Symmetry: D2
Subunit: 248 residues, 4 copies
Amino acid sequence: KILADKVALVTGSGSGIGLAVALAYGKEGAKVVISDINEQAGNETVKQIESLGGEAVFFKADSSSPADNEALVGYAVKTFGRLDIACNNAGIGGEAALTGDYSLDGWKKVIDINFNGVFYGCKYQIEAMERNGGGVIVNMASIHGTVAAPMSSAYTSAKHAVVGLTKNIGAEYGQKNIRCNAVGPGYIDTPLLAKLDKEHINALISKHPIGRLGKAEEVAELVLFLSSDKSSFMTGGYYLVDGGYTAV
Amino acid sequence: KILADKVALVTGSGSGIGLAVALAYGKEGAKVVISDINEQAGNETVKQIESLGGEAVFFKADSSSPADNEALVGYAVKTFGRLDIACNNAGIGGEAALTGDYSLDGWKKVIDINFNGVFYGCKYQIEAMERNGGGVIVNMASIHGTVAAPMSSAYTSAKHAVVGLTKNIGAEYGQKNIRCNAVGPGYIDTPLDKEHINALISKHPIGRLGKAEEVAELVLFLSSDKSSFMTGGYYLVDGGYTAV
Amino acid sequence: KILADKVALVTGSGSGIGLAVALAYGKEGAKVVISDINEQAGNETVKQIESLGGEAVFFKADSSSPADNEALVGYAVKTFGRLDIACNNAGIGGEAALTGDYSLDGWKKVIDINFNGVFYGCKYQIEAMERNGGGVIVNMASIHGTVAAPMSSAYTSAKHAVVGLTKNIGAEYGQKNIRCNAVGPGYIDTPLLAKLDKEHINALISKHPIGRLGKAEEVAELVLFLSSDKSSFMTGGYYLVDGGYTAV
Amino acid sequence: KILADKVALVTGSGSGIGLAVALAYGKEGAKVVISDINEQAGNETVKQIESLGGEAVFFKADSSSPADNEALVGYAVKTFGRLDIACNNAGIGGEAALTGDYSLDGWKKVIDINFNGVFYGCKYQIEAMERNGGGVIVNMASIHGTVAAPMSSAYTSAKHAVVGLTKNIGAEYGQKNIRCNAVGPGYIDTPLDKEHINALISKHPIGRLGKAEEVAELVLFLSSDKSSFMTGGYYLVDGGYTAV
C-alpha cells in the first residue's frame, strides 16, 4: 500500500474527481479526511472507503473560508495525528458569459472558491506539514490553467493562478520537504456533462485527440502518483491529464 | 504618429512602467487618460505629456474597485467620445512572506489589485470598445506570470491569472475586433541591498535590469495596428530571465 | 528610418514572409542582403526594394549548406561592411504523413533546411556580429514550435528545435550584445494555401480565433520590431503572431 | 506487476536513467529489450534484471541509425511476438562550446543521436505497435526541452525537438491507441568541479540533484495503464528547476 501510515485530505470529495481521489487514497492505505459542502455526499464517500477496508472521516467545510480551512486541517491532525498529503480539489465551473458580460458576483464566487480557497487550504496545510516533518500537496488545476475556455474567464484565470501558486510553493519549500504540484485535467465525464446537449458533448470530444472524454479514475491515478513517494523529485510542476487537448 | 486620434487609458500611470507607457502613447498621438491612486503623480504625468505637446487628462481611481474602473472608462468615453486602447498596469508587490506565513489581509490586498482589478478594468473597457467597433487591450503581467517569485506567492498567482484572462479575452473577441495581449517584464530599474540587486541582475542573461521605456516600446507595438494578427498572446520583455 | 545604417540578411526572401520581411527592412533604411534558392525570385525582391528607394543585393544560397551560409555572411560583410540583423526564414513544409509513415529522406530534408540550416546561419551570423560589436537575430519558428501539426512531425520537431536554439543563443550572448528571438506565425495566406481545397482552408481558419488567416505583412511587422532597437530588452524569447491559435 | 506480459524496449539502457528504467520495467513484469552502443554495459543490465527474476535480452544498436532502430524493434517482435512499450533514452551531452564556436561535426553528432535517432526509434516502434493494437512510448527529453543550457545548444535544440515530436505522435495516434509522452529530467547524479556541481545544485529548488530511480518512476507510470488519459504531454522531473 503506497500511502500506508499517511494521512491525506481531499477537498470537494463528495463527487467526481474528488471522490475518485479519495477512493484511490483509501485503497492505498491512507487515513483519509473527506471534506465537502454537502454532508450526505461526504458521508457516502466515507462509507465507500470503509466498505473497501479503508479508514476515513468527514468534515464539512466551505473551501472559500480561511477559518473553515484552518479548522479542517486542525481536525485532520486531531483525528489522525498529522497531515502528510492534501489534494485541493473543491472548485466550481462558474457562469458562462463573455468576459465583458461576466457578472461581478459570479466572478468573485469563482475566484474565491477556485483560487483564494486553494491558497487558504495550502496555507493551513503547510503549517501542519512543517510541524510533522513535511508533506505533499496536489493542487487541482485544469487544461484551463494553460489554455482559454471561452465564456469561462473566471475559471481560466483562477486555474492559471493555481498553477502560479503551485510553482511558488514548490520553489519556496523545496528544502523544507514540502512538494507541491498541479494537475491539469481535460474534460471528464460528469453528470453535469450529461446535462449538456449532445452536440456540445461531441464538440468537446473533438477537441481531445484521444477521441473520448476522460474518466475521474484516470485523473485520480495521476493525483495518486504525485501524492506518493514515487514522485520524490517532482515539485513546482504542472502535469496534464487531457487526452492530448493542449498538444494541438 | 502611429496612435493618431486614438483614445488610450493607462492605469497606474503616475510612475514606473505605467508612466513610460503613457509617455509613449502621448508621443504617438493618442489622447491619454492617466489614472493612479496618487493624484500628485498622475497630474505630473499629464503635465509631462502636455509639455511634449500631447493631450492627457487625469482620473483618480482605485484599480481594485469595480465602480472606479467603470467610472474611469466612462470618463474616457465622455471626455473623448470613445475608447480605443487600454493598458492595465496598476499593481502592487505586496508583503514578502513564505506562502504558509502570508497574511490573510495582505493576500487579499494583492489579489484584489493585481488580479480582480485587471478583470474589472477589462470588463468595462471591453464594454466601451464594443460600442465603437472594437479596440486593443494590453494587460501588464510579469515574468512571474510563468515562473515563481519566492516570498511573493500572491503576486505570482495574480500575474498567472492575468495571463489566463488575456488568453480568454483574445480567444473570445477574435471576431469582434478586440485584441488582448499580455506583457511580461523582467526586473526593471525603479527607485535595497546591493547584494539583492546583484542577485536580481545575475538572473537576467542580458546582464542588467531593464528600463521602463524598454517595456513601454513593446506595449506600444501591441497597442498599435502593427500587431494586427497578435491576440491572446503573452510577450516577454525580460533580458532572457525565463529562457533559463 | 528605424534601421538606418544597419545591414540586414533575410534567407528565403524570394516570396511569402521572407519577401515581406525584406521589404519592411528595406523601407526602414537597412541595406538588405536577399538570399534564396531561386535567383529570379531573389532578383525581383531586390528590384522591388530599389523601386521604393531602398538598397539591396541578392546572393544565391542553399540554406541547408554550412558553406553557403558562411559565404552568404561573407558576402554581406564584403558588400556592406558589417552584419547587424539576420532573419532566418528559409523553410519548407515537408511531406504530409503520420509519424510512423514519414519517409527517411523527407524527414532529413525538413530537418536539414528548417533546423540545421538555421543553426548554420546563426553560427556564421554570430561570427560577423561579434566582429562588428553585436547584432540581432530573428529565427522564424511557427505555432508548430509549441503545438502539434498532425501529418507534419518533421516540421513540428524542427520548429521546436529552432525555439530551443533561440533560447540558447539569447542566454549565451546576453552580455556580448547579440539578441536572438523567435517568431511563431499562425497560418498565413500563401498561393500554396490557395492550392489547398476550400474545406481544408475553412478548417484552418476555424482554428484561429481571429477568424481569418494572417498576412505576410503582419508577420513582418513583428519581425521588424524584434530586429530594431525598440526590442532592446527582449532576448531568448518566442513571440506568437497567430490570431489566437495557441491561446485555445 | 503493472507491466505483466508487456514487451518493452529501452534505448541506452546500459547505464544512468536508461538502466533505472530497464530495472523498473523488469521488476514490474515486462519482457525487456535492452539496447546500447556498449555491449558490456547492456549485457550487465540484462544480468541485473535476470538476477532479480525478470526477463531481458540485449541488442546492440547505434540509435542514430535508421536501420539499427528498425532491427531493434524487429528483434523485439521476433523474440517476444509484439512491442507494447518503448522508452527512447539513448543520447549524448555533446561538446561544450558557445553556439558560434560549435563545431560542424560535433553539432551533427548530437542532432543525429538526440533528435533524428529518437524519430527513427519512434517510427519503427509505431509501425510494430499498430500491428498489435497499439502501445505506449516515452521519449526522454530534459529540462532543456524548455530552457537553455548555455554551451550545449545542440543538446537543447534536440531536446526541444523531442518535445515537439512527442506532441505530434500523441495528437496523431490518439484514436489508434498509441500514447506518447515526454519526460524532462533535471540534473541527475551520474559518475567535475565541486563549484560546477554546487552551481548545478543551486539551480534546483529542492536543494539536491535527482536520482536515476526517481526519473524511472515517472517513466514507469507513463508506460503503464495508470496513465491511460495522458498523451502528447511533457512531464518534468526536475526538483523545481523550471519553476523559477
